[PDB]
Each structure stands twice: as C-alpha cells, then as structure tokens.
Amino acid sequence: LRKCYFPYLENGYNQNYGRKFVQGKSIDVACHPGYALPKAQTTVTCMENGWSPTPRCIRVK
C-alpha cells in the first residue's frame, strides 16, 4: 500500500516530478509530441509505488 513518487521523464514534461500519490490513484502525464504511455494512455495509475503502466513516454511516432 504504497505512495508512488513521480519520476523524471526524459522525453516528457515532468510537471508532476516531485509529487507523491497513494496507490489507487491516477494522473495525467504529458509527453512530447510522439511520446506517450503504454496502452495509448496519457494517464498513469499509482500502484505499489512504481506506477501501474509506468511513466516513461515511449515513442508512438
């Protein structure tokens, strides 16, 4: 029952970097044009500290 720390996105806008959220939460993560999250998502779900879908901004193109 953790509290995910929001990490730094190399190819994304770390607007939320520095914030902590409790597991069972979601939050939007804007990445640069052509970068996004898994499952075509823009939102990450706080789970077990390590964000369910993982905020990393992969290149969609």
Swiss-Prot record:
It is found in: Secreted. Residues 2-59 form the Sushi domain. Expressed in the retinal pigment epithelium (at protein level). CFH is one of the most abundant complement components in blood where the liver is the major source of CFH protein in vivo. in addition, CFH is secreted by additional cell types including monocytes, fibroblasts, or endothelial cells. Disulfide bonds join 4-46, 31-57. Changing residue 46 to S: In CFHD; with membranoproliferative glomerulonephritis. Changing residue 17 to H: Associated with ARMD4. Sulfated on tyrosine residues. Another study observed glycosylation at this position. Glycoprotein that plays an essential role in maintaining a well-balanced immune response by modulating complement activation. Acts as a soluble inhibitor of complement, where its binding to self markers such as glycan structures prevents complement activation and amplification on cell surfaces. Accelerates the decay of the complement alternative pathway (AP) C3 convertase C3bBb, thus preventing local formation of more C3b, the central player of the complement amplification loop. As a cofactor of the serine protease factor I, CFH also regulates proteolytic degradation of already-deposited C3b. (Microbial infection) In the mosquito midgut, binds to the surface of parasite P.falciparum gametocytes and protects the parasite from alternative complement pathway-mediated elimination. It is linked to Basal laminar drusen: Drusen are extracellular deposits that accumulate below the retinal pigment epithelium on Bruch membrane. Basal laminar drusen refers to an early adult-onset drusen phenotype that shows a pattern of uniform small, slightly raised yellow subretinal nodules randomly scattered in the macula. In later stages, these drusen often become more numerous, with clustered groups of drusen scattered throughout the retina. In time these small basal laminar drusen may expand and ultimately lead to a serous pigment epithelial detachment of the macula that may result in vision loss. Complement factor H deficiency: A disorder that can manifest as several different phenotypes, including asymptomatic, recurrent bacterial infections, and renal failure. Laboratory features usually include decreased serum levels of factor H, complement component C3, and a decrease in other terminal complement components, indicating activation of the alternative complement pathway. It is associated with a number of renal diseases with variable clinical presentation and progression, including membranoproliferative glomerulonephritis and atypical hemolytic uremic syndrome. Homodimer. Also forms homooligomers. Interacts with complement protein C3b; this interaction inhibits complement activation. Interacts with complement protein C3d. Interacts with CR3/ITGAM; this interaction mediates adhesion of neutrophils to pathogens leading to pathogen clearance. Interacts with complement factor I. Sushi 1-3 domain represents the minimal unit capable of cofactor activity. The property to discriminate self surfaces from non-self surfaces depends on the C-terminal region made of Sushis 19-20. This is Complement factor H. It comes from Homo sapiens. The gene is CFH. The chain holds residues 386 to 446 of 1231 of the full protein.
